[PDB]
Swiss-Prot record, chains B, D:
The isolated ADP-bound cytosolic domain forms a 6-fold symmetric protease disk and a 2-fold symmetric AAA ATPase ring. In the absence of nucleotide the AAA ATPase ring also forms symmetric hexamers. Its EC number is 3.4.24.-. It comes from the Bacteria. Its main location: membrane. In the central section; belongs to the AAA ATPase family. Binds 1 zinc ion per subunit. The gene is ftsH. GO terms for cellular component: plasma membrane. This is ATP-dependent zinc metalloprotease FtsH. Keywords: ATP-binding, Cell inner membrane, Cell membrane, Hydrolase, Membrane, Metal-binding, Metalloprotease, Nucleotide-binding, Protease, Transmembrane, Transmembrane helix, Zinc. One of its GO terms (biological process) is proteolysis. Its cofactor is Zn(2+). Residues 1-421 are cytoplasmic.
Length: 406, 421, 411, 421
């Protein structure tokens, strides 16, 4: 167990993970100079858990932190510890941490943690991990980062405060994100001037960083195979087939549905501000609830208006919307005719009341539906622009959207 | 869990399924050394779904694959998870796969997969499926005679994306199965398995294995050392078809599904139709399969799908003037879809974009029924307009069907095209 | 199972929880020296149940009691027991208590008890029951358990001889938030502009966990900019952060809650058979008239809402439930209805839809009448209503000879 | 089952129940040597039913009897049989009595006897009761605060044919109970149990034992060796009555039951009335007791019994103009009897001699409700005619009741006679 002798990486080498980079920048500030936190009692987490599917750059990330703070990086694999003789596992964990302390500040990284953080010698090995986590002085500038695509496997003792109580979700990249990852893995290659990375991004939905690096490589091998000294656009185009889904008709629909939720939310006075759209309170008032119900129905409202047809897409929204309305009527005393009474809780009321409840509930949801439809029809052109962008980029930010709603 | 200690089997021991053996020979080549495929990027399926009626050797083939690759075989049963306490189901799925990997390469078999694939237990299954590395030499196989009941999420790519249909065996296939289960039995000279295969129409492997045992018993009863032909003749009658007027109806029912599906604009492409009593290759079954390609479905798609479902019955009524029990399952499926349109998808006129479900009044209960009946009826009457309008094509397709029994690929498409060009 | 290896704490580390601390003082003295009680046969409970929302310091109090008594503390989580294989749970409980006895006096603390005490879970719990019944209080063992989900507990756990004593741990009001900040600040360098009062006042809804995190987020903001002191701006900004990471009460909402609570207060006072009202805070044989009064008061918060703001909020949902429980009980049990007569309707309903319909009407009529009567009262005493709210928004909690007199000067 | 290993108790340890001790001193004389009674044919009861509210020392007395006769004591709990699987209940009753006889003479105690005496489990109990030989020195004792709920078959002669009522203790009785639970405790000189008894109205034994413990705890908390008077004062407030306008109402309610019962021709003789908060000696409770004398009951008897049940409420309304929750249990009992008349006894006009019970239509459900309401209402209005007609007597009975609190025997009868002669 020694400082990794692999190539230095920084955040300049990670594409499509800005949210995560931002969370890790404070960890980097800390490794470069722990005293700035220590002297005012700013406590950092001892363990950070990176969650995400394979090849999304969980490891890259860990390595970038180390490289950016210019600090050693210990890379361990959790699948190493399975299958060990009796005791050997604990002893390795002990030695790992002993080393980490000799070399602090530093990052200790445990890949595929689920493999050890899960019924025999694993107990021993894991218990030791737990003891060492509890054991080390954060102030020393030690941070253990851990990665998994399988977080529901993990022994909850690992996620307890003082341990791995910071999770950072690392998702598959959107279209811009994939464009950046191509930039990165292309830095050092000879590209022809016809290579359009945006188009390649557009044509690689679902690809993760690991897939894109592969694609670039297949591009390069293709040109090389043919005795050429620049990689061209036809090479990347051909490559994509090599490293290899959802209709474009279906993409359209999803986009309008999502744009729908967003437009209504924005327009409705009490809506929830929209932080992001993607195609991959304590007290609450009557008006608040109606504005939310209405937003909830916008997806469907936008399908009906734009396509005339409706899809199964809004099943969950309808359930949600209905639930709210039933609650307004039976628990929150917010109905016209039924009064400030609690109807139900099962069913402790008559068929006459059962029927009134259904009318009121129907009345509320129908009224909200229509309202959503008016908003969509009223803002059709901007809905269309939003969709126009959303289809291209896959995700769009609120500030942008509110803008387009000029 | 602990791998099967049941006697190893090879394809040597499976008769009447040469088509299926074919497709699985690759899997065996993979299990024996996954490195040859790995090295050049040959990506195998993570899941294979065995479809066919009971006693057709689904379980057998699975084990034949495992024996043929001399790899361990985990047999799990689908009905062993239903009925379990809170969580037990998931943790058993967990354990399953934990074992699978420790013994890779290996085959995990999940019989009666419909039992689990109709919350927690499945969700877990799904996550394991996508969680394991194909390249480690793990292939999960599953069987079902109820493919129509499975959650469409199981058939998504990266899961049970390939499926093999295992049919009841015809006369020649029955003879082979008889020969296999008679290998280590003492036959009289007079015994002619040929005639026995001919005289056992409809029998599957399981039933034939059973007939054979019943023959042995007749011999033993009398204290004899050779099983005679009389013993086989007599046995058939202990275990105990279709008429050339009933053949017709089946023909018209299946043609029906075909014609409506072709004509209706959102219909499911038709790749094969068949009148083999219970082959799961028929279109009648296919129509009952869950959508594996799309996530979204539109109201018109459903109306078209509904109308195809009722095409078999539409045909029977138009052509025969009455109706048979044949369409029970189509009716049940049609009705589920209607209810779902109305109570979950908000696809009804009068009921609005509301989720109903019971949570609601008699007065609503009644509108729902009215609305569901309306949809199915209109769809039924559409199917009949179509049948009548395309009666000649219907007649022509039956004529062939009666003769050929099963129409499959490039040939099926010539005929639908000639007929609807 | 071993005693915890975390830092020993005391009541010097708990803030805003004086009532809970006072009930727990007995326990501390016991654990310091059980003989003192055993000497005169003062029987202590075997189990104390701490009830309250997440992050209010249920775990902290328990630790605080152990720390104050300088006795070992076993920290167990109920969430560990569910999901376990056949038997392993029972055997764990058995080990857990074996150790308890070998380290006694001591505290065994079971967080999230509702996870075990809501096949196999049955056995696991059964085993708990056995051990509880099975240990000698005299030997200085106390089992404490936490939950914010008490209604979900099996009543077997609450039997005498088991978890037969409960302490409720409330969320902190202004002054309590103030103290929690001072505590989590003891050892940190604050700028001279930092006013924890103001920050207290801006963090209604915040529990101890929330505030401690607040302070750490303030520290991280200073540290990130390389500053050697935490400033007011850091706390102010931190609030907005803790929020968007994982409920503050808005000022608009504070307003509504105030009127709601002031409403109950006003109606209760005015109504002849009202329940004396000892405190307001933002955070046998009864007669019909008594019941209509009680009903009227229960609806006062909602009435104050409707009258003052026009709108109504989800905030009266439980009051509505309770009011309805009362009206049904008047109609279906006490024979206090106009038209339904002196009959017991129900006991589970054993009556026609025709009656069920009359009942709903009669229950609706009672509640509606009391609600309107609540509004007549609010409107009639809008002035005093407004004065009570004004004060309440200043202090958040009004109590004692101070609430005593406010109600007098006003009525 | 195995006899109690709990500390032996004597009457020395039971305070405030001298009346009950009296009646049980005979039982003790019997247990110590059943031969003295046997020899001259003195037949003792086979069952004694202890009635009173919880924490009044019912269980205690049972054990006091057993300790005082130095005989074994089997404590069974009624709620231990409900919830048991098919048969388990009976076989446990069997075992119980099998043990009883092997250890005779002895006392079998069955707490919460209502729990079992509201099929198989009771039926078995009944047969054992009558199955065992009194003369073998076996007396079964049972307790309940719910005598009204018991099957009248338990109170039949040869069973629990004698019952003792245990009341909450008045001030003097509370003082004694305090003195007992303080015997082996270290009291400060200033401690005056007198004042404590006076300041604890309504407290039962259980509650007083508890107050005492709470005092000890206050001492221990502060590390003190004597429990002080402040400690008792403070304790009361930790554990925590009737008004002279509420006293009135209770008075009028109980008078009510009395007046209607006397006037109504089939009424249950009235032996005592009482306003002690919850003495089970009140007529209000008595009326709720099951008929132990007769097997048959006639429709008019029930109507009269129903009318007496509503007399308490009739009184409240007539005299006060409104009504209180006081009559909830009377209403519930009245209604059960009405339903029973209509759905089981065939005692309704419109419904005929039919058993309804649910097994029947909404349309019947409705007539039943109409009919039940009719009966109870008519009976209620009869009770009011009576109250109003006998208002003066009602007033007179209250006057006494307010003063004396409990009227018992020869005296009660003088006054009812003077008043209704
Ligand atoms: N976001 C990314 N930006 C740039 N390269 C990436 C990214 N994600 C993955 N890659 C490339 O693919 C390789 C595999 O990524 P890895 O860190 O092993 O992913 P994970 O740890 O999630 O399995 C990385 O070394 C990197 O070169
Ligand atoms: N194709 C076949 N050839 C020979 N024997 C067969 C065949 N199919 C089934 N059998 C016999 O009958 C049994 C079929 O049962 P099973 O394996 O459960 O098939 P399924 O999964 O289709 O129900 C086998 O165990 C085998 O003994
Ligand atoms: N009343 C309080 N005073 C000081 N700190 C508190 C308080 N309540 C919570 N905390 C802080 O937040 C943490 C709360 O966690 P915990 O005690 O687990 O709450 P609970 O058990 O109610 O969920 C404590 O460790 C403490 O640091
Ligand atoms: N009359 C009494 N005198 C002294 N102590 C009593 C008396 N009644 C009850 N107690 C105390 O309180 C407890 C009463 O509980 P229990 O025996 O169950 O009575 P019950 O059967 O009426 O509930 C007794 O165990 C005893 O310690
Ligand atoms: Mg990886
Ligand atoms: Mg089968
Ligand atoms: Mg908690
Ligand atoms: Mg009792
Ligand atoms: Zn949606
Ligand atoms: Zn069909
Ligand atoms: Zn309220
Ligand atoms: Zn009464």
């Amino acid at each position: 167990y020694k400082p990794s002798g692999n190539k230095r990486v920084t955040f300049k080498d990670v594409g499509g993970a800005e949210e995560a980079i931002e969370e890790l920048k404070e960890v980097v500030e800390f490794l470069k100079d722990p005293s700035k936190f220590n002297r005012i009692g700013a406590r950092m987490p001892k363990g950070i858990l990176l969650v995400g599917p394979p090849g999304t750059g969980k490891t890259l990330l860990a390595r970038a932190v180390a490289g950016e703070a210019n600090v050693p990086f210990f890379h361990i694999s959790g699948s190493d510890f399975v299958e060990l003789f009796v005791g050997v596992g604990a002893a390795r964990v002990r030695d790992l941490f002993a080393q980490a302390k000799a070399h602090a500040p530093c990052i200790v990284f445990i890949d595929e943690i689920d493999a050890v953080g899960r019924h025999d010698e694993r107990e021993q090995t894991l218990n030791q991990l737990l003891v060492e986590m509890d054991g080390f002085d954060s102030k020393e500038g030690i941070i253990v980062m851990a990665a998994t695509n399988r977080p529901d496997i993990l022994d909850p003792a690992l996620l307890r405060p003082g341990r791995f109580d910071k999770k950072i979700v690392v998702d598959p990249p959107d279209m811009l994100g994939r464009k950046k990852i191509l930039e990165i893995h292309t830095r050092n290659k000879p590209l022809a001037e016809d290579v359009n990375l945006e188009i390649i991004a557009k044509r690689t939905p679902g690809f993760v960083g690991a897939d894109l690096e592969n694609l670039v490589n297949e591009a390069a091998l293709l040109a090389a195979r043919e005795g050429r000294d620049k990689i061209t656009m036809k090479d990347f185009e051909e490559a994509i087939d090599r490293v290899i889904l959802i209709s474009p008709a279906e993409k359209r629909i999803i986009a309008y549905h999502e744009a729908g939720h967003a437009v209504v939310s924005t327009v409705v006075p009490n809506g929830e501000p929209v932080h992001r759209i993607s195609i991959i309170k304590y007290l609450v008032s009557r008006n608040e609830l109606l504005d939310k119900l209405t937003a909830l129905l916008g997806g469907r409202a936008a399908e009906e208006v734009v396509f005339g047809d409706v899809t199964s897409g809004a099943a969950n929204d309808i359930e949600r919307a209905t639930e709210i309305a039933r609650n307004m009527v039976c628990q929150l005393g917010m109905s016209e005719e039924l009064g400030p009474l609690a109807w139900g809780k099962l069913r402790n009321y008559s068929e006459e009341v059962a029927s009134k409840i259904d009318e009121e509930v129907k009345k509320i949801v129908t009224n909200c539906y229509e309202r959503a439809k008016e908003i969509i029809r009223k803002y059709r052109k901007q809905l269309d622009n939003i969709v126009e962008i959303l289809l291209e980029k896959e995700t769009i930010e609120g500030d942008e959207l509110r803008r387009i709603l000029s």
